[PDB]
């Protein structure tokens, strides 16, 4: 079984805007999480082929990762901050769905998520 194509990251048939919340999600939230010591497994789609996890995309039908989030922010793919926040949440929930609760990767994800939520609770007000 091969990997599915990545999530869509660019669409010209979608309206474009820059907002201070979206800027903050890229420049502060994504940047912070990306540099975190546990970020590495979440920086690109799960390569189920390379990792030998043939069951991954049988279980995870809404894949998401921070590489995809980065491209989406870069390409002005999101109109609303909540679209991006949803993608971060999808990434975390996917990890919790797929892996056993005691797995190293789950505990790593939990630490990343704690950080994520700290940065999200400080989301600047709509300018
Ligand atoms: C069936 O195994 C999965 C569930 N248990 C936890 C992880 O198990 C340890 C790996 C070790 C390496 C292996 F090849 F032998 C396969 C078992 C497994 N889940 C996951 N394993 C690896 C990754 C990962 C992806 N990219 C880079 C790295 C360094 C690791 C991931 C990543 C995510 C997001 C995930 O949900 N599960 C993973």
């Amino acid at each position: 079984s091969m990997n599915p194509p990545p999530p869509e990251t660019s669409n010209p048939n979608k309206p474009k805007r820059q907002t201070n919340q979206l800027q903050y999600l890229l420049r502060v939230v994504l940047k912070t999480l990306w540099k975190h010591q546990f970020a590495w497994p979440f920086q690109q789609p799960v390569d189920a082929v390379k990792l030998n996890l043939p069951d991954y995309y049988k279980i995870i039908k809404t894949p998401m990762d921070m590489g995809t989030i980065k491209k989406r922010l870069e390409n002005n793919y999101y109109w609303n901050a909540q679209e991006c926040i949803q993608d971060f949440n999808t990434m975390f929930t996917n990890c919790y769905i797929y892996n056993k609760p005691g797995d190293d990767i789950v505990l790593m994800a939990e630490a990343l998520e704690k950080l994520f939520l700290q940065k999200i609770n400080e989301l600047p007000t709509e300018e």
Side-chain angles (χ1 to χ4, degrees), residues 40-42 44 46 51-53 56 95 98-100 103 105:
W40 163 242
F42 305 96
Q44 53 282 310
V46 169
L51 297 165
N52 194 18
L53 302 165
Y56 188 84
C95 186
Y98 174 70
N99 310 276
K100 311 186 295 305
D103 287 348
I105 191 74

Side-chain angles (χ1 to χ4, degrees), residues 76-89:
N76 305 109
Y77 180 95
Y78 301 125
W79 188 261
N80 290 327
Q82 278 313 307
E83 294 177 281
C84 175
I85 295 164
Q86 184 186 108
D87 279 349
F88 275 106
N89 287 332

Side-chain angles (χ1 to χ4, degrees), residues 62-82:
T62 310
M64 186 57 48
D65 64 280
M66 297 197 291
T68 298
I69 292 166
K70 183 178 174 279
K71 289 174 177 211
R72 288 176 167 200
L73 285 161
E74 283 165 354
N75 298 341
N76 305 109
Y77 180 95
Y78 301 125
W79 188 261
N80 290 327
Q82 278 313 307

